[PDB]
Design a protein around this ligand. Structure first.
Ligand code: GCP
Ligand code: GCP
Ligand code: JJQ
Ligand code: MG
Ligand code: MG
Lengths: 167, 167
C-alpha cells in the first residue's frame, strides 16, 4: 500500500486543523484550539489507487517553530495554507516555502498553495495575487472552505498527485 | 514541562476515538470511522501541574494487531477500554493487559480500566464484575460516557496520576 506523508503548514489561525478534521471526520470545528502537533492516518482512494495518508497537523504558533525541522525533513508533500481574509497569513506563506526549500535543499518539493475560508465575505487577499505566487513557485493553487468542504478533497488529492509526480 | 505518553487501547467499537475526541474537543462523534492510528499533543493542568499529554488513539481492528508492539514499548500509561454493552470487548481486556505486561516486562504498568458507553441502557457487563477484574489487576476502574462526558476527565487524569504515582 502506497503511503504519502503530508504536512499541513501555515500561520496560526488559517484553518489547518479545521481542514484536516473536515477531511478526516467530515466535521467543521468552530472552536480555536491552538495545535502543538497532531497526526492522523487515513485510507483513501485517489485515481483508483488505495492510498494511506499520514497527515501531520502542525503548530502555526511561532513559539513551536523549532519543531519544523524534523517534519520538514520527513514530510513528502506540504499543504501551505493561508486564509483569504488574513493578509498577514498570505505574507507568511513565502517564509514557510523558503524554510521547506532550505531543509530539503530543493526547489522541487511537492506543495500546494491553499487559500482557506473562501466561504467568508471579508476577503482581503485577491485570488489573482495568490494564483501569481503559486505560479512563481510552479505549484497548484486551490481555494477551500473547511466549513462547507469546498475544495477540501481537491487540495489533499492534488498534493498526493504532486508527490506521485516527484517520485 | 512534564510529558505523559498515554495510549488508548481496546476492541473495535468500544469508543476509544469518541473518548479521546470528547476529552480534547468537548463534543461527541456519532459516526463510526475505524482508526488506523491518530496522535494528539495537548496541554492540560492536572493537580496544579501543567502537563503535556501525548495521546495515542489506536486501532481496535485485529488486522492492525502487529502495530501494538511499538506503541506498547513507547507508551507510559494505558487506558484499557471496553464497552459496557459488549461482553467480548470486556473479555479482550485481559489480552491487552497480558500483551502490555509482556512488552514492558513488568506487572506494574500504569493502567486504568474504562467501562465506556455507560449512558446506554443495554448493559451486558455488571459494574461489580468489572470492579473485580480491576481489583485483580491492582488498577483503577472508571465507567465513562463519550456522549455525556461522564467520567471522561477522571479516566484520563487518573491515568496521568498512575504514571505520576508509579514515579
Ligand atoms: N468560516 C470559516 N472558518 C474557518 C475555516 N477554517 C478554519 N476556520 C476557523 O478559524 C479558526 C482557526 O481554525 P484552526 O483550524 O484552529 O486554525 P489553525 O491554523 O489550525 C490554528 P493553529 O496554527 O494554532 O493550530 C477557528 O475558529 C475555525 O473554526 C473556514 O474555512 N471557514
Ligand atoms: N452511546 C454511546 N456511544 C458511543 C460512546 N462512545 C462511542 N460510541 C459510539 O460507538 C461507535 C464507535 O465509536 P468509536 O469511537 O469510533 O470507537 P473505536 O473504539 O474508536 C472504533 P476503532 O477500534 O475501529 O477505531 C460510534 O458510533 C460512536 O458514536 C459512548 O460513550 N456512548
Ligand atoms: C513519519 C512519522 C513517523 C513522523 C510524523 C511526525 C510525520 C512527519 C511528516 C508527515 C507526517 C507525519 N506523521 C508522523 C506522526 N509519522
Ligand atoms: Mg491547528
Ligand atoms: Mg477509533
Amino acid at each position: 500500500m502506497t503511503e504519502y506523508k503530508l504536512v499541513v503548514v501555515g500561520a496560526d489561525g488559517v484553518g489547518k486543523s479545521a481542514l484536516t478534521i473536515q477531511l478526516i471526520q467530515n466535521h467543521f470545528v468552530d472552536e480555536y484550539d491552538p495545535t502543538i502537533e497532531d497526526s492522523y492516518r487515513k485510507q483513501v482512494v485517489i485515481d483508483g489507487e488505495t492510498c494511506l495518508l499520514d497527515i501531520l497537523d502542525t503548530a502555526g504558533q511561532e513559539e513551536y517553530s523549532a519543531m519544523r525541522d524534523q517534519y520538514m525533513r520527513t514530510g513528502e508533500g506540504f499543504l501551505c495554507v493561508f486564509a483569504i481574509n488574513n493578509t498577514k497569513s498570505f505574507e507568511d506563506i513565502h517564509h514557510y516555502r523558503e524554510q521547506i526549500k532550505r531543509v530539503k535543499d530543493s526547489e522541487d518539493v511537492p506543495m500546494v498553495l491553499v487559500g482557506n475560508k473562501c466561504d467568508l465575505p471579508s476577503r482581503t487577499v485577491d485570488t489573482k495575487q495568490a494564483q501569481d505566487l503559486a505560479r512563481s513557485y510552479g505549484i497548484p493553487f486551490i481555494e477551500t472552505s473547511a466549513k462547507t468542504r469546498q475544495g477540501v478533497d481537491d487540495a489533499f488529492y492534488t498534493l498526493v498527485r504532486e508527490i506521485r509526480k516527484h517520485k
